[PDB]
Design a protein around this ligand. Structure first.
Ligand SMILES: *[C@@H]1O[C@H](CO)[C@@H](O[C@@H]2O[C@H](CO)[C@@H](O)[C@H](O)[C@H]2NC(C)=O)[C@H](O)[C@H]1NC(C)=O
Ligand SMILES: *[C@@H]1O[C@H](CO)[C@@H](O)[C@H](O)[C@H]1NC(C)=O
Ligand SMILES: *[C@@H]1O[C@H](CO)[C@@H](O)[C@H](O)[C@H]1NC(C)=O
Lengths: 56, 49
């Protein structure tokens, strides 16, 4: 429900009409297919909130 | 407010209830169909009053 944005060093997702940066996560995003098709795709971490929970 | 044209078209796909990856995964097909359809306007307006 947002747009991916960078401040020059870090990547965030925001709502479109008001700047409010959030960490990119598996809850903020959806997957479709692999890296090869999309024109202008960028490499970044996507955080998964379950993985530190499994680390408990 | 500037936005890249393909990202503006992904917002417009969301507005008709089609998911954004349907644009980015088909972007050349969508751009070719637009460029082709504008050529039909050009020819139709040149062809008949
Ligand atoms: C982009 O945003 C990040 C995260 O807010 C900024 O990183 C922080 O910057 C301050 C000042 O250098 C540090 O004290 C923090 O430790 C940094 N946090 C992290 C997680 O790296 C970053 O400075 C911003 N970049 C620009 C160019 O403004
Ligand atoms: C973006 O535009 C610049 C300037 O024309 C070009 O160098 C770059 O390759 C383009 N990248 C994409 C993903 O379109
Ligand atoms: C993105 O990451 C992959 C795998 O690490 C790498 O092959 C590719 O060259 C990277 N692309 C860019 C634009 O850096």
């Amino acid at each position: 429900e947002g747009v991916f944005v960078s401040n020059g060093t870090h990547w965030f997702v925001t709502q479109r009409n008001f700047y409010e940066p959030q960490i990119i996560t598996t809850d903020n995003t959806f997957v479709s297919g692999n890296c090869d098709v999309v024109i202008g795709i960028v490499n970044n971490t996507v955080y998964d909130p379950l993985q530190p929970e499994l680390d408990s | 407010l500037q936005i890249p044209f393909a990202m503006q078209m992904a917002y417009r796909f969301n507005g008709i209830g089609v998911t954004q990856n349907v644009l980015y995964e088909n972007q050349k097909l969508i751009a070719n169909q637009f460029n082709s359809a504008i050529g039909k306007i050009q020819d139709s307006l040149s062809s008949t009053a």
